[PDB]
Amino acid sequence: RYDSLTEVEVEGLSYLYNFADGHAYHDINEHYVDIINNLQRYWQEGKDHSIPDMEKAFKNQFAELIDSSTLHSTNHFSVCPTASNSIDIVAAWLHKENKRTALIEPAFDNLYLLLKRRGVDISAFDELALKNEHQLAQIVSSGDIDALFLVNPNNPTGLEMTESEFVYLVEQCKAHNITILLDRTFRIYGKTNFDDYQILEQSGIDYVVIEDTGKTWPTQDLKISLMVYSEAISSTMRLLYEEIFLCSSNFALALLKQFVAVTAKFGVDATIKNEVRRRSETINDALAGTGLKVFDNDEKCQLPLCWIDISATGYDDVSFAARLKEHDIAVLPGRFFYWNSKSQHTQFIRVSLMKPDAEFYEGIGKLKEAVTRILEKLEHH
Amino acid sequence: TDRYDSLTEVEVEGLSYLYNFADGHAYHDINEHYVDIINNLQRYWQEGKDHSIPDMEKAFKNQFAELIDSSTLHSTNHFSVCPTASNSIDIVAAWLHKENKRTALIEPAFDNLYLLLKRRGVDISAFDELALKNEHQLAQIVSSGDIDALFLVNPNNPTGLEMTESEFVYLVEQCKAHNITILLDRTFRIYGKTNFDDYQILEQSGIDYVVIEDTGKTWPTQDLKISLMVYSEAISSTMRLLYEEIFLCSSNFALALLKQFVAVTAKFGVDATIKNEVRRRSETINDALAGTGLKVFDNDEKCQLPLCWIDISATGYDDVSFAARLKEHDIAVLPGRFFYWNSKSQHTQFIRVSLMKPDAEFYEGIGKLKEAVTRILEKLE
Ligand SMILES: CC1=C(O)/C(=C\N=C(/CCCNC(=N)N)C(=O)O)C(COP(=O)(O)O)=CN1
Ligand SMILES: CC1=C(O)/C(=C\N=C(/CCCNC(=N)N)C(=O)O)C(COP(=O)(O)O)=CN1
Secondary structure, rough: OOOOOHHHHHHHHOOOOOOOOOOOOOOOOOHHHHHHHHHHHHHHHHHHOOOHHHHHHHHHHHHHOOOOOHHHHOOOOEEEEHHHHHHHHHHHHHHHHHOOOEEEEOOOOHHHHHHHOOOOEEEEEEHHHHHHHHHHHHHOOOOOOOOOEEEEOOOOOOOOOHHHHHHHHHHHHOOOOOOOOOEEOOHHOHHHHOOOOHHHHHHHHOOOEEEEOOOOOOOOOOOOEEEOOOOOHHHHHHHHHHOOOOOOOOOHHHHHHHHHHHHHOOOOHOOOOOOOOHHHHHHHHHHOOOOEEEOOOOOOOOEEEOOOOOOEHOOOOHHHHHHHOOOOOOOEEEHOOOOHHHOOOOOEEEEEEOOOHHHHHHHHHHHHHHHHHHHHHOOOO | OOOOOOOOHHHHHHOOOOOOOOOOOOOOOOOOOHHHHHHOHHHHHHHHHHHHHHHHHHHHHHHHHHHHHOOHHOOOEEEEHHHHHHHHHHHHHHHHHOOOOOEEEOOOOOHHHHHHHHHHOOOOEEEEEHHHHHHHHHHHHHOOOOOOOEEEEEOOOOOOOOOOOOHHHHHHHHHHHOEEEEEEOOHHHHHHHOOOOOHHHHHHHHHOEEEEOOOOOOOOOOOOOOOOEOHHHHHHHHHHHHHHHHHHOOOOHHHHHHHHHHHHHHHHHHHHHHHHHHHHHHHHHHHHHHOOEEEEOOOOOOOOOOEEEEOOOEEEEOOHHHHHHHHHHOOOEEEOOHHHHHHOOOOEEEEEEOHHHHOOHHHHHHHHHHHHHHHHHEEEE
């Protein structure tokens, strides 16, 4: 039995065709090439500027990309080397302030593990409550919770809140003095475009927002996670941050600031979303007619991953992933995302898209052949 | 608030001052031995792409084992790789709490070691750094039955206290005899004067241990760092579980870049690449403070850390007040009381001045520091 999704992902790192973890590792495209050709420029940029100036410069470049004037305005933020570090500091804050916390389900499981490790009193809430107004109202009205930890858009389902859904969420939390923790790790893949920072700040609620470069720009896990919070909790949030970190890397900030700038210059679609679409189509076309059904609906966004229903095969997720491993292919069994109800959700695997290009395409062809060979060996049984 | 609550808070404030001698992160200029690395950053970007994460983890660990000439470290696969040394300490603290280990922490110590253990809920007691050099005092500590784990820093920051081989062997013998777990922070290892194989001694003894390494105080890579966390076989499963709650991995680019810095240091020697410049800077600040009434902390048993620990008793000023006066002259130093994390009020007579700052800022700032010190003292008379 696996302890966690990360245990599976670590094992996957040793496989020929690794589709387990969702960290961005695709090849540098035509537009980002110039950045690698000029690494020395960003090394020099880091040397020539103060740590506070580089922090603000990256934050503001990101605010320009997502067109949030509210984020551009605020100085209440810190810079972590990883998004999991931002999540963990938030969990330390929730425990310190004694906030009973409802955590979205499904979720990448280390969100639950970090909250649990920090001593947070955790309960589950269905991601679909973000799209059902009175299901959400009952959750926040119960007097059972003081905070709501969500992921938007959500991993692995691509569930994404509309502007009106997000406004309703903030209004309900405001009326019940509920703190919102908002994990925006997959923001750039979303289909929506509204200023969620503006809605949060104008409401007056306490909140933390977590951003991440690591699922989006392929920088070999040299990452930046912005952790942004309301004025009223900034002193304590910053104190907890400083127990761990003095700062992140000025080199990493200068480098990632340019990745963000290039994405702004050529747009999201040409630099990120079109590639995700093409790789999505590759898997869909490969699995057509096999009985494996890619999860899809009208409302979801396209994450850098595919959520696949394998129920037609008669295997559960852990079983099927074990067979694929004998063919040098590593996938993520899906049950762990349903961290409060794993055994009711054993029919899915997750396959990540943003892998090294040659490995990815060769690997999907091997995956199609392995599925074929696995199912035909099952006809002989 | 009006006062300082942590060394990191003072260091953050110091980031905005013209002459910042506060934090101890390596920020000196790239010397002639390292310039070829920066001139060819693309080579290490490419190397990170060309190797799997586990194989680059091992390649860095092995290159470091070569530099420190430890066949034991070279042999072991029980280790994880963190982006910062603070992350490694935090995971160790989480392990101490999970395993219900009453922990004696060295005093003095850089204060976030104390803060992290306290934040994780560890049951903390202080022990005098001088116990490491007095056999009877250490034996009383481990045989009391009041502790289960001993957290030490060797060589110690800010005093430069360093264990001899026979002193280290005695420590391990005594902890073994009382089943005390050793947590060994070797952040400043490369500055020590000794050369023995501590990994061999720990492995041979059979005790439970974690060793923490760091590049950040030694090689100037703009806080793009690597921290090896190496541990005994018997605790490897649980240590790796806690690591994997927070990290999948660190950066392969970071590992490739830092591996070269290590390799070059091993090729040309730690004196030519590191220690010689440290000597020049220590002599520089020693000559500047001579005859001021400020007493540089010194003895014939310490090693030379990249920092200067200074008794300001003769000023009549306490450390925070004196640091406040220097700030008025655009000079940031570290008040020493927070290093005595269990007894701050009894140790207010020291400041710490870091040495490995950008070259022109350092030598110019020592001149400004001498002038500010002279002017502040003349006004008292
Ligand atoms: C919604 C969300 C995630 O899905 C997520 C991570 N997802 C992963 C790999 C996690 C690897 N394991 C770990 N970080 N302990 C995935 O494969 O989708 C993180 C943290 O990102 P970092 O791993 O710290 O860079 C934050 N929010
Ligand atoms: C013995 C030791 C230290 O002295 C130390 C840090 N010393 C510092 C700056 C710490 C800045 N603040 C922080 N990490 N929250 C000094 O100025 O000496 C660390 C952690 O290293 P990192 O800061 O995480 O890179 C581990 N072991």
